[PDB]
Amino acid sequence: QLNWLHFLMNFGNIYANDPDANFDSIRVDADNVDADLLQIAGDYLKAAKGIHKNDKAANDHLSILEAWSDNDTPYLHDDGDNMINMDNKLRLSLLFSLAKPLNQRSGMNPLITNSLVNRTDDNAETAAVPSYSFIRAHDSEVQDLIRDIIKAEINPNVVGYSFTMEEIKKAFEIYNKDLLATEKKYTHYNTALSYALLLTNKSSVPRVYYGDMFTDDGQYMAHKTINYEAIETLLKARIKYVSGGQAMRNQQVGNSEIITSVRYGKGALKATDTGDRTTRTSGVAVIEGNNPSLRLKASDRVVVNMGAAHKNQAYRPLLLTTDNGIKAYHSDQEAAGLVRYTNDRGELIFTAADIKGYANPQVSGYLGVWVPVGAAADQDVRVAASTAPSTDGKSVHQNAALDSRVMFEGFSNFQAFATKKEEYTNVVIAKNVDKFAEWGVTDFEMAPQYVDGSFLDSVIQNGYAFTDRYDLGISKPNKYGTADDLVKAIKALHSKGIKVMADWVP
Ligand SMILES: [Mg+2]
């Protein structure tokens, strides 16, 4: 229903008499999506928000399709890029090359080529097709893993997803211990390696999942994951360093392989571009392996071309793999003891002294990330959207301005129920908006707000009549707080210029 969409996009106007309390954008939350409905949703955004006119209008109302497939990408593209779809091939490359157990783990080449964008050499001012990229989401796998854990370790007779509260309790004890284990029976390997690629890739809007920075269970933002520090470090570095063209390479070395991923720096689309002073102190190198047994030969070298702005230059680590986890460096001074140089050609050179396989709770393989020395404390290589008219018939354009955005899926289906007002998700969001701004979050994907411990979207969406979808914590609190708490959260995100995405189930 399009009149329910109209209500959601005017919730601030209708409930609060306050346009600053309106949602900015739409998550089209499908089973199957009819192409006709995608066209009508696009028509709403063009008529109401003028997204066809220029990138500033489009990027202030950036809307997505969630249909668990790539299938609608051609139709969305042909209909004028009025919303962006997921890059499902890249998600599957991250899952199989990095996250899977060793006996199912793919070679690393798909991380480069098995995507909407072949990132071997991505030098485009504007990518052909816009997208968002992610590794996990609220319904990507946890419900399945909790079922697997209960079936294997607690109750082998369980039918479907019909669990007792005590079964889910016990299953999360096992799940949470597995997150902290080197040898993982259930949970994903190499989360930080997946985020290092997601947050340095060109030509996609990355979406960070709440449950990769905080525990999937327990109170909102109460318990940081072991990967919180690595992911926060990458998010802050993305603002400061991540710009320009991309090169990805895949080298056989010793008994295994590595990939390299380079961004040339702001104002350098090609490896030959020299750019300006800001190009010199931006860009990044990511080095990854997915094999804990990786050992380089004494003669093995990994030569990493940083681009023509980076000849004869000091580099320092951002993230390095250690025996026990990942060390983060928060300044040039903190990394002073590990400075290395590019040569006359702008190449970093790594050896067995730098790269080997590790097995720890965060890494199954290898991660190293390097940034140029000398960035100002306030350096920000993001760019604002153009107000010049769009001239190709498309609304959303995957250019440097869209690449500057970060989406945050700001909920877990398995969050604990608040025991006091201070624990309500929407109260906590309002209190912590400075943190989302620090991370470069531009688009905040909120939980469904209408009026329950269900963790299956199927059960939730079946459990509420069409009138229930107008009750956004109004008749009684939703799981996330009162309607007034929702209004305050939307206004708080707007106070930092962060856009807020409504969950629209057609
Ligand atoms: Mg969905």
Author numbering: 233 to 262, 264 to 684, 688 to 742
Give verbatim excerpts from the published study on this entry.
Streptococcus mutans, a known etiological agent in the pathogenesis of dental caries, expresses three genetically distinct types of glucosyltransferases (Gtfs; also known as glucansucrases): GtfB (GTF-I), GtfC (GTF-SI) and GtfD (GTF-S). GtfC synthesizes both soluble and insoluble glucans (α-1,3 and α-1,6 glycosidic linkages), while GtfB and GtfD only synthesize insoluble glucans (mostly α-1,3 linkages) and soluble glucans (mostly α-1,6 linkages), respectively. All three enzymes belong to glycoside hydrolase family 70 (GH70), which cleaves the glycosidic bond between the glucose and fructose moieties in sucrose during catalysis. While fructose is released, the enzymatically produced glucose molecules are sequentially fused into a growing glucan chain and, depending on whether a 1,3- or 1,6-linkage is formed, the resultant product is either an insoluble or a soluble glucan, respectively.
Initially, GtfB-CD, like GtfD-CD, underwent proteolysis during crystallization setups at room temperature, which we only identified after the structures had been resolved since the gels after purification appeared to be satisfactory. Our attempts to stabilize GtfB-CD with protease inhibitors proved successful.
